[PDB]
RNA sequence: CCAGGGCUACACACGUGCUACAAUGGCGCAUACAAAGAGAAGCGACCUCGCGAGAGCAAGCGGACCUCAUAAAGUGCGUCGUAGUCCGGAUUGGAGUCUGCAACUCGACUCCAUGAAGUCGGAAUCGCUAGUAAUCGUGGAUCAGAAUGCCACGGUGAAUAC
RNA sequence: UCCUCCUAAAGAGUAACGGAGGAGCACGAAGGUUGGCUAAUCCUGGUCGGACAUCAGGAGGUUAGUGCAAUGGCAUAAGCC
């Protein structure tokens, strides 16, 4: 690369609250904190969600109850 | 911080903080808090990490930001396919819930521009 | 929205549905009693439901299991 | 580097074997990431390009190229030669660190993450993403930002047919919709 | 005579109101001082359940004794710190309660979520001379249910008239 | 008055109140040189983004470009940096 015309490139670590703590180069400036990664979104389940979207006719089940 | 998916208001207590969240006011709030065990009047500021993390799967029992956004469209789409009454006045843009329009019903009309 | 205790159905649509479900597919259900829930054993009838002066057809699917009948009989017509 | 020896170990067997290939020099590899920023309010203000190329190299980490309109544009009012965005290539060891910290830093502080497409593939393997919110990469602070600046990454491959493009990210967990 | 629908429609214009745009305020907690009136196919304690609207059980009262019924502005203390903001509450979604044969058209109320217009209003124009204007709550009739209307009642309480 | 094409009859030249258009400059780089580069218009994909900005790729092969009219020329580029 050329010199003196890019920003502070520098190694940090970075730490997620599922437990991932992981060491990248970024110029964040140091020590960025995390509260979601790769392997703590919901991609597995939270993708799910309204995907199940729920019956109708079992609502009157739950209002008839007979 | 990053309180289910946005939150970062600062200087404010965290029963007002928190209701930045698509999905909580000020009673929601209130039982997130306890059930977190924090005193609702401090600041985003003054949180230790071993609090912020408490509160993210404390809000992330009730439906916010993300998900309730489909949930109520959809349930507005179900409506509006459905080609019921209320459907039918969600396609117009009128007021569903029963209430006069002779006169009144700017927030579903907008402003009276001719 | 009203009465948790047993939903609302008219009976002359009542008895005139148990008849119906159990003799298939017919003509459609004329009918009155708008103000009547859509109880789950109605699924695929073709009920006609007043609007006033006529009786429109509306074709009852699973998701109207809530409702009632008038909702979907638009009363007053417009521009 | 550490997606790129993940890839020299366990892609690329992964993907050999995937495709049946006769060699090592045909799985497809990713040679490029670049990084647009179409700014298009320059004509206004030429502070607010720059206020979008210093993002740019807050999130690359190498000063970007201000792009100068190529033809001329009425319907946008531009004239050939004005700077209107502003993009960044990433090759090679920055470019791997790049990918790392995009799939596993930024694209889970998506506000509404549901999948990325399936069917944004350019038809050669070359895959394109929008991001419409700068402020998922935790380089840029949030006080700081004045507006919202939404950019959108292209990452270039050498695959053949993009269904060799498909499988090639799903090997880094690019995880899909 | 009957059922269902309409009287509640909605590009718009007007009248009369209600609630606002906040700090002389909002919210949280604690706490003080009324008058008038209604009540028996009615008012409904206390107790228990429910976050709540309410429900169950149910005394008492045709009433200066029983119930509706904790008056609210006030005052203390804390917080908010001038922001479309802890202002404002429309609208909409979901979940309910009650009345009634029945709440879709088309009821009131509660809960959770939402949180729009609005930052004092053009030309114009209205009311008011003292316990008045302003402001705060309460009751009644009509009524199964359904008022910000109406008719009453008290609380605090001005300015100005050459 | 000057420039370009046609009339003009395959060298040159050639008329008409014949058919079409331009010029009375610009440029201190738009000149010299060295080094480099290759267009138009579509197609698909892509935040705002739209027939139409900016990206990536493919097709295409100069239909682009030339300070200025037209013809001749131009990839060794005379085009672009």
């Given at each position: ?66 | ?114 | ?79 | ?14 993907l050999?074997?995937e495709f ?8 497809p590899?990713v ?85 990325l497409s399936a069917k944004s593939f350019d038809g050669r393997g070359n895959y394109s993403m ?25 990452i270039?491959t050498?695959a053949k047919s993009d269904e060799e493009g498909r499988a090639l990210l799903a090997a880094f967990?690019f995880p899909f919709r």
């Amino acid at each position: 690369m050329k010199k003196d015309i890019h920003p502070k490139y520098e190694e940090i670590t970075a730490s997620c609250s599922c437990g991932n703590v992981m060491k990248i180069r970024s110029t964040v400036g140091h020590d960025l904190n995390l509260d979601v990664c790769s392997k703590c979104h919901p991609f597995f389940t939270g993708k799910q969600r309204d995907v199940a979207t729920g019956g109708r006719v079992d609502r009157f089940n739950k209002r008839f109850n007979i | 911080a990053r309180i289910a998916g946005i939150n970062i208001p600062d200087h404010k207590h965290a029963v007002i903080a928190l209701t930045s969240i698509y999905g909580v006011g000020k009673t929601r709030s209130k039982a997130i808090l306890a059930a977190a065990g924090i005193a609702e009047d401090v600041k985003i500021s003054e949180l230790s990490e071993g609090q912020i993390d408490t509160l993210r799967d404390e809000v992330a029992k009730f439906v916010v930001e993300g998900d309730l956004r489909r949930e109520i469209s959809m349930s507005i789409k179900r409506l509006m396919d459905l080609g019921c009454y209320r459907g039918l006045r969600h396609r117009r843009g009128l007021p569903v819930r029963g209430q006069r329009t002779k006169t009144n019903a700017r927030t579903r009309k907008g402003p009276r521009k001719p | 929205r009203s009465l948790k205790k047993g939903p609302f159905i008219d009976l002359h649509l009542l008895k005139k549905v148990e008849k119906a479900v159990e003799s298939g597919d017919k003509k459609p259900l004329r009918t009155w009693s708008r103000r009547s829930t859509i109880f789950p054993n109605m699924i695929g009838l073709t009920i006609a439901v007043h609007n006033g002066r006529q009786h429109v057809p509306v074709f009852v699917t699973d998701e109207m299991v809530g409702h009632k009948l008038g909702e979907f009989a638009p009363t007053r017509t417009y521009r | 580097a550490k997606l790129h020896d993940y890839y020299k170990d366990e892609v690329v067997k992964k993907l050999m074997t995937e495709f049946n290939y006769n060699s090592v020099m045909q799985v497809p590899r990713v040679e490029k990431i670049t990084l647009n920023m179409g700014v298009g309010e320059a004509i206004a203000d030429k502070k607010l390009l720059d206020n979008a190329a210093a993002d740019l190299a807050a999130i690359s980490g190498q000063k970007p190229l201000i792009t100068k309109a190529r033809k001329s544009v009425a319907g946008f009012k531009i004239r050939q030669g004005y700077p209107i965005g502003c993009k960044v290539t990433l090759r090679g060891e920055r470019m791997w660190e790049f990918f790392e910290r995009l799939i596993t830093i930024a694209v889970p502080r998506i506000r509404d993450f549901r999948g990325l497409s399936a069917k944004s593939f350019d038809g050669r393997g070359n895959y394109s993403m929008g991001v419409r919110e700068q402020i998922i990469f935790p380089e840029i602070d949030y006080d700081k930002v004045d507006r919202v600046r939404g950019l959108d990454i292209t990452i270039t491959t050498t695959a053949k047919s993009d269904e060799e493009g498909r499988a090639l990210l799903a090997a880094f967990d690019f995880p899909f919709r």
